[PDB]
């Protein structure tokens, strides 16, 4: 009942810290989670949100959805078949996804059973005191104690949970959690929100909808994907529209009621209405701090409910740390993992290291997808007196042949024009998430535009566009956009 | 007519040099090529080998071939359709490619028409004297003179040409040139060679072959794709096999005769026989120097027939330069282009610049493809006392579902273990050519393995495998492999 490290949440951050502490530094580690495999009732399980109801199944389902475009695009290359025979079997997809996720759940079970001094406990972790975690049967802090774990070090890694707007009829709505288990593909669906989850699910539902189907995405403000490159936000909007998705911007559900046939009658704040089979809310995720009973030991939370941390993931309470989505910063699996690897290398390795939250490569598995690293030009322009933007945008030749002429590839490089340092790189098109990864390494090394343009291209690729840009398309001078420098 | 620069060959390198010299340095520039658009009889044309009968059309055709896998793989993700209705219409592919290539031909024609001081001459360029290029009707130096071009400076940029082995029945075989124009997809095809062209065309023909068809690749050595990472050579061999291609290693054609039905009867040196509809030779490319009459000026060649150059692409003759495949260094479009740009900066800009032929990102559009940059571990092991290899290899989750479980993704990072400096990165899998580009930029910046590991991954991707490797899989110490 005594451990060097007790980890609450067997997720992206918690398992990296757990596994590293045990295998690299021979520490004794307890990891707590509420469930051993994916799905209802608690959705996240052993492996965490990404594995169970996140990156991993989403990416499989986006890959499934991409075959709608491949089957169509094949014709330009001479592929012939009965287009009238094409059916998308959603139930097949969900069964394949469930088996893939279950195998990961079982692989992490193997990990725990095989590894000496790495123990999994099932149930709800909360803080009794500075150095004791209690595991209870439920999230009710009044439920039975299953275990009482003594901890020299405590890691909070409980991740996040979907936010559901408190509107009349919210009980008729789902989150991404339930989207992964829909028994049938909705004919009509409203994805609510302008972020990556709404956009990615609009793509998935668009490909699997039965005949006479319609995907509508609504977003309360003027343009989806706030925080991404503006050219890309506008282009994704166009390319989703071109593939049959209806984008309702400046719109937000005020309420939902059930029609007598079980369908949903959505009333917008504007007075507009829409009938759909599914209303998927994807308006935000909030850190999971409530169930940890953090008041018991006085861990400080943020305005927003995230665990306050320093650069070394330390709470205000010594021996208690917090990584990943519970900190309510960048909610990405590789950031959680990086934080956990740094924390353990620091605390047990005696090799202090801090996660760099700048120049983080990330992606949106929109069709086609986004790959991005570092600053968008609007942000650069407020920090740097002179910003250059290098931009290449065109329909690739293969998509002039495929018939998807609307698939404009966008490559933007944002520099500090004073020394040429690359501040950010923004890609839209097939392979963007794959192209961007080694760009993250380039930015860590303070690559300049001349490092890209002096590197020899791999031909033919989309990626080589990044090595062909010698001349700014335009600038920001003290925050002001202009074609040419003074 | 008098020019600052005469370029022989309107190809990848020749067009970069000509355009830069005309537009960046205000020089009067002539460019010579033998055809204004793609295809028979001379195949290459305005735009070069890559445009007309190389990178551009082959990439479109491999993209085409990939649909055979996408159609099959779609089933694991719940896609249903009438498989018996599926036809690969090669005629449509070739027509689509022909249009794309012709549009590029036309765009280069328009570039010459609209760029003052940059003039195109049709015909066969050769050297009359160290400052005179003659353009003739044909490759025969007795053919009619169309032009005599006075040149302060001459750039040789005639590229390469397929090697055909002097075997009985060589006349019954084709090269990649003819493969781009086959009117019907061959039912049975032998690709001869273990290089990228053979492997890429094997995958193209494998997708478009009519029912009951068969693609065979033969190679004299034990393992295809010499020069590539050995794990990747082994895996690509298995993944081609898994997709129905017969890989005949330690095998080479001795002769070809016609069967009575016009099909090709192949006799290998081993005494194996194979009847095919097409024999595509992809055994090598040789620099195109014959037609240039370089004996008129005494430009130094190799016994191989390449133009010898210094690091600045200068021949032994002042004011005569050579770039691209004719130099037999690295036969890649972006290298030819880099050499042309560096030559013109050096000569006309007095901005001395030499192409770095190390740490060049490249690709093989096999199915699935290869992306690579820098040294393979056997080469590193000879140049560095201690070499570390970091390796990740596995069937991606999407290919467990697709049913292509043979599609092992391979990612390997080779380091100087003394300092962590990355020497080579080698990828096999969907997206590898796209992943490797920014790796090229990493190696220019002397990235170390710590720079990869400490970078945050993009998830889920194949590429992130490069940024999660902390610990070597194995080492080479003084040339010797140690686990
Ligand atoms: C639909 C969706 C798609 C996403 N796609 C991507 C993507 O493509 N790429 C990407 O990088 N990120 C993606 N993310 C985000 C990513 O899932 C998270 O950033 C990541 O999982 C956070 O890791 P973590 O370690 O903070 O927690 P998690 O991985 O969420 O692990 C938290 C775990 O703690 C458990 N838990 C919670 N409270 C308790 C308690 N009191 N006691 C015990 N156990 C508890 C939960 O059961 C859960 O398993 C996606 C998220 C979602 C929802
Ligand atoms: C099938 C194939 C696939 C390839 N795929 C790739 C790939 O994916 N990526 C890559 O980077 N490289 C690829 N390459 C290599 C690439 O095509 C060459 O490296 C590149 O084209 C060479 O450029 P260059 O300037 O040397 O010559 P070229 O582009 O070959 O141009 C030479 C030109 O000179 C002309 N010419 C020749 N003799 C004369 C004469 N006497 N007078 C006038 N004109 C003349 C020819 O008509 C030709 O247009 C491929 C090659 C082939 C054959
Ligand atoms: C499919 C399975 C065999 C598997 C499991 C683990 C890896 C390692 N990889 C995982 C994703 C990132 O965290 C980077 C490291 C790769 C493959
Ligand atoms: Br060999
Ligand atoms: Mg154990
Ligand atoms: Mg002109």
Closest to A436 in 3D by CA, of A420, A424, A448: A424
The CA distance from A385 to A387, in Å, is 7
The CA distance from A184 to B254, in Å, is 61
Residue B82 at interface with chain A, using a CB cutoff of 8 Å: yes
Backbone angles phi, psi at A3, to 5 degrees: -135, 145
DSSP string, A245-288: -EEEES--EEEEEE-TTS-EEEEETTS-EEEESEEEE-S-EEE-
The CA distance from B283 to B253, in Å, is 11
The CA distance from A62 to B77, in Å, is 10
Residue A371 at interface with chain B, using a CB cutoff of 8 Å: yes
- Confirm or reject: Cβ of B328 under 6 Å from ligand 2: no
Closest to B76 in 3D by CA, of B395, B478, B425: B395
Experimental approach was X-ray
Residue A388 at interface with chain B, using a CB cutoff of 8 Å: no
The CA distance from B467 to B475, in Å, is 19
Helix, strand or coil, per DSSP, at residue A408 = coil
Domain ranges in chain A?
1-162+284-358, 163-283, 359-470
- Written as six digits, the tokens of B295 are 């004996």
Closest to A175 in 3D by CA, of A284, A267, A94: A284
The CA distance from B369 to B365, in Å, is 5
What residues form DSSP beta bridges with B268?
B253
Determine the distance separating the centroid of ligand 2 and the alpha carbon of B10, expressed in angstroms: 9
Residue A401 at interface with chain B, using a CB cutoff of 8 Å: yes
Helix and strand element counts for chain A (H, E): 12, 25
What lies within 8 Å, CB to CB, of B309 at 6+ separation is B315, B321, B322, B323, B327
Closest to A29 in 3D by CA, of A47, A9, A12, A45: A9
| Element holding B91 (H helix, E strand) | helix B90-114
Task: Give the angle A235-A239-A245 at the CA atoms, nearest 5°.
Answer: 125
Residue A356 at interface with chain B, using a CB cutoff of 8 Å: yes
Catalytic residue among A172, A399, A426, A459: A459
B15: buried, middle or exposed (CB in 10 Å: 19+, 13-18, 0-12)? buried
Sort out which chain B residues have CB atoms less than 8 A from A38's CB and list them: none
Q: Where does B193-263 show beta strands of DSSP type E?
A: 214-219, 246-249, 253-258
- Confirm or reject: Cβ of B457 under 6 Å from ligand 3: yes
Q: With beta carbons less than 8 A apart as the criterion, state whether B276 and B216 touch.
A: yes
The reply to whether residue A438 touches residue B441, judged by beta carbons under 8 angstroms, is: yes
Q: Max Cα separation, chain A?
A: 72
Helix, strand or coil, per DSSP, at residue A125 = strand
Letter string b/e over residues A78-109, b meaning 16 or more CB atoms within 10 A of that residue's CB:
bbebeeeebebbbebbbebbbebbeebbeebe
Helix, strand or coil, per DSSP, at residue A240 = helix
What part of A 144-203 touches B (C-beta under 8 Å)? none
What DSSP state is assigned to residue A134?
Answer: E
Q: With beta carbons less than 8 A apart as the criterion, state whether B199 and B240 touch.
A: yes
What DSSP state is assigned to residue A469?
Answer: -
Dihedral angle computed from the Cα positions of residues B117, B123, B125 and B129, in that order, rounded to the nearest 10 degrees = -80
Sort out which chain B residues have CB atoms less than 8 A from A464's CB and list them: 334, 437
The CA distance from B44 to B159, in Å, is 10
The CA distance from A22 to A19, in Å, is 5
DSSP string, B127-161: EEETTEEEEESSSSTTSPEEEEEEEEEEEE---EE
DSSP string, A296-312: GTT--B-TTSPBP--TT
| Pick among A456, A462, A464, A469 to test the B interface (most B CBs inside 10 A) | A456
Residue B81 at interface with chain A, using a CB cutoff of 8 Å: yes
- Confirm or reject: Cβ of B473 under 6 Å from ligand 3: no
Distance (Å) of CA B213 to CA A188, B186, B190, B265: 44, 8, 11, 16
The reply to whether residue B441 touches residue A447, judged by beta carbons under 8 angstroms, is: yes
- Residue identified by tokens 């793509």 is A203
The reply to whether residue B466 touches residue A356, judged by beta carbons under 8 angstroms, is: no
The CA distance from A433 to A410, in Å, is 13
The CA distance from A50 to B97, in Å, is 42
Estimate to the nearest angstrom the gap between the alpha carbon of A42 and the chain centroid: 19
| Pick among A47, A77, A430 to test the B interface (most B CBs inside 10 A) | A77
- Written as six digits, the tokens of A147 are 């275990």
B459 is catalytic: yes
The reply to whether residue B93 touches residue A78, judged by beta carbons under 8 angstroms, is: yes
Radius of gyration for chain A, computed over Cα atoms and rounded to the nearest angstrom: 24
- Confirm or reject: Cβ of A9 under 6 Å from ligand 1: yes
A358: buried, middle or exposed (CB in 10 Å: 19+, 13-18, 0-12)? exposed
A378: buried, middle or exposed (CB in 10 Å: 19+, 13-18, 0-12)? middle
The CA distance from B79 to B94, in Å, is 28
Q: Which of B63, B454, B455 is opposite residue A77, by nearest beta carbon?
A: B63
Q: How far apart are the first and last CA of chain A?
A: 69
Q: With beta carbons less than 8 A apart as the criterion, state whether B438 and A435 touch.
A: yes
Residue B449 at interface with chain A, using a CB cutoff of 8 Å: no
Establish whether B196 is an annotated binding residue.
Answer: yes
- Written as six digits, the tokens of A39 are 């799905």
- Confirm or reject: Cβ of A66 under 6 Å from ligand 1: no
What lies within 8 Å, CB to CB, of B236 at 6+ separation is B199, B224, B225, B228, B364, B366, B370, B428
The CA distance from A460 to B55, in Å, is 7
Establish whether A64 is an annotated binding residue.
Answer: no
Sort out which chain B residues have CB atoms less than 8 A from A355's CB and list them: 456
| Element holding A208 (H helix, E strand) | helix A196-208
Q: Whose CA is nearest to atom 7 of ligand 1?
A: A55
Q: With beta carbons less than 8 A apart as the criterion, state whether A343 and A313 touch.
A: yes
| Element holding B63 (H helix, E strand) | helix B55-73
Backbone angles phi, psi at B230, to 5 degrees: -70, -35
The CA distance from B360 to A450, in Å, is 16
A158: buried, middle or exposed (CB in 10 Å: 19+, 13-18, 0-12)? buried
Establish whether B193 is an annotated binding residue.
Answer: yes
Q: How far apart are the first and last CA of chain B?
A: 67
Q: Which of A91, A451, A461 is opposite residue B437, by nearest beta carbon?
A: A461
Determine the distance separating the centroid of ligand 3 and the alpha carbon of B59, expressed in angstroms: 30
Establish whether B213 is an annotated binding residue.
Answer: no
Chain breaks in chain B (C to N over 2.5 A) after: none
Closest to A140 in 3D by CA, of A38, A290, A282, A11: A290
Distance (Å) of CA A149 to CA A1, A12, A293: 5, 21, 15
């Amino acid at each position: 009942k005594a451990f060097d490290l007790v980890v609450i949440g067997a997720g992206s951050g918690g398992l990296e810290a757990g596994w590293n502490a045990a295998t690299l530094y021979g520490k004794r580690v307890a990891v707590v989670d509420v469930q051993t495999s994916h799905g209802p009732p608690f959705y996240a399980a052993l492996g965490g949100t990404c594995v169970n109801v996140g990156c991993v199944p989403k990416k499989l389902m986006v890959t499934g959805a991409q075959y709608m475009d491949h089957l169509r695009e094949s014709a330009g290359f001479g592929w012939e078949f009965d287009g009238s025979s094409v059916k998308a079997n959603w139930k097949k997809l969900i069964a394949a996804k469930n088996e893939a996720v279950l195998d990961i759940n079982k692989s992490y079970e193997g990990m725990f059973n095989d590894t000496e001094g790495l123990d999994f406990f099932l149930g709800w972790g909360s803080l009794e005191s500075k150095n004791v975690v209690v595991v209870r049967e439920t999230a009710d802090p009044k439920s039975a104690v299953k275990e009482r774990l003594q901890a020299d070090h405590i890691l909070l890694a409980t991740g996040s949970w979907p936010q559901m707007p408190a509107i009349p009829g919210i009980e008729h709505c789902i989150s991404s959690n339930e989207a992964f288990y829909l028994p049938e593909p909705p004919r009509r669906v409203l994805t609510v929100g302008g972020g990556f989850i709404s956009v990615e699910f609009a793509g998935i539902f668009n490909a699997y909808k039965p005949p006479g189907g319609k995907v509508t995405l609504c977003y309360r403000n003027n343009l989806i994907l706030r925080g991404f490159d503006e050219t890309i936000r506008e282009e994704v909007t166009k390319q989703l529209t071109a593939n049959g998705i209806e984008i309702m911007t400046n719109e937000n559900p005020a309420k939902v009621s059930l029609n007598t046939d079980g369908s949903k009658h959505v009333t917008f704040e504007s007075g507009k209405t829409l009938d759909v089979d599914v209303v998927m809310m994807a308006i935000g995720r909030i850190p999971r701090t409530n169930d940890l009973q953090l008041g018991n030991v006085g861990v400080k939370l943020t305005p927003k409910g995230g665990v306050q941390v320093d650069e070394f993931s330390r709470t205000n309470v010594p021996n208690i740390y917090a990584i990943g989505d519970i900190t309510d910063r960048l909610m990405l699996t590789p950031v959680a993992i990086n934080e956990g690897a740094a924390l353990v290398d620091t605390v047990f390795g005696n090799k202090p290291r801090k996660t760099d939250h700048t120049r983080v490569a990330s992606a949106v598995f929109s069709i086609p997808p986004i790959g991005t690293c570092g600053l968008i030009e609007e942000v650069a322009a407020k920090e740097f007196e002179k910003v250059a933007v290098y931009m290449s945008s065109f329909t690739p030749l293969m998509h002039n042949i495929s018939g998807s002429k609307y698939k404009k590839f966008v490559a933007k490089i944002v520099t500090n024009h004073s020394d040429g340092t690359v501040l950010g790189v923004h890609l839209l098109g097939d392979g963007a998430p794959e192209i961007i990864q080694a760009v993250g390494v380039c930015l860590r090394l303070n690559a300049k535009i001349s490092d890209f343009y002096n590197t020899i291209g791999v031909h033919p690729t989309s990626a080589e566009e990044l090595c062909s840009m010698r001349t700014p398309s335009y600038y920001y001078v003290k925050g002001e956009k202009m074609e040419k420098l003074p």
